[PDB]
Amino acid sequence: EQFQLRGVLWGKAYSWKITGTTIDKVWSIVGDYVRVDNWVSSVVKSSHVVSGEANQTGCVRRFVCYPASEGESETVDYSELIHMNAAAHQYMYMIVGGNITGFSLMKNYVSNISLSSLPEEDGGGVIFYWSFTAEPASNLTEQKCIEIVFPLYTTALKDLCTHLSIPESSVTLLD
Amino acid sequence: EQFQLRGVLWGKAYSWKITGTTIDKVWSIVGDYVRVDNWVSSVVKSSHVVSGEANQTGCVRRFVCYPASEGESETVDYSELIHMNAAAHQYMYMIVGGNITGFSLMKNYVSNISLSSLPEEDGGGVIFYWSFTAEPASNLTEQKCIEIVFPLYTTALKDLCTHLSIPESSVTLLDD
């Protein structure tokens, strides 16, 4: 009959409907965690595992991003896979280092990806769930985090279509 | 060029499609965080806010569960709301105290609830996303965690239908 208060979190969750594809096809790109360069290829130049075994829980990926603008340097993201369930097409990760533009500003950025199949009889398709949280800190606001994260998710959904060779119209942001 | 290794997590995410209702009817039940007794009524006897403002982030609810099986006693759950975006139909909470059966065994049980609408153009309907994580601990297993959580979520979706006055056939667990 007692309890201990914890800190509150910032963040937001997004869901897209994707037609003209299957959970396996989406996963073949999105599920290769340590080769994110083969997914968000418009932002990410290269990626490889630097700790643990590729795509296994606890592993760390290091990926390199193209310069944010001309003159600026490439930036780096280290992120740990903190939960992986490939059979259930879902995983969870956190940035544990690097100077990746914007994302490296957040405190304990944690992200969740979940894929689901819509019923066969409803025309199939995939529900792509993608959320993040970050801890409140004085150099940011929740609104500023959203302005960092959401545009990237949007780009990644576009880059997904490119790699799937399906039109961008295949993707609809729910709500 | 350095990073900081951390521990891994246990958990699982589930999604259901719910027909025959609207996202705002579902939210009126599911979104009323401190009155979970009006939702999972097969399990929860009573509930109220005990810290902060009702359903505002940071608040804590205390709720009483019926005996889990015959002979046992009522148990109690203290859970804190740690994120809330009502207009976006999504929130996050964590158990911060109590002896609630099964759930209080987990270390740092964190849960996420997210509602979305399917396109009007393609039938409508609500996608109900519900996930949890817990921190691995010597006294438990992830499989045990899933045995604790999933039947509760399952029961909760059935109770939701009761309170919405829609057939339980309205709910379908999505393949993952």
Numbering used by the authors:
A (entry chain A): 9 to 183
B (entry chain B): 9 to 184
Q: What's the publication's text?
A:
Hydroxynitrile lyases (HNLs) catalyze the cleavage of cyanohydrins into the corresponding aldehyde or ketone and hydrogen cyanide123. In addition to enzyme characterization and synthesis of cyanohydrins, we determined the tertiary structure of Davallia tyermannii HNL (DtHNL) and proposed its catalytic mechanism. The enzyme is a dimer and exhibits a Bet v1-like fold. We discovered a protein with hydroxynitrile forming activity unique within the Bet v1 superfamily.
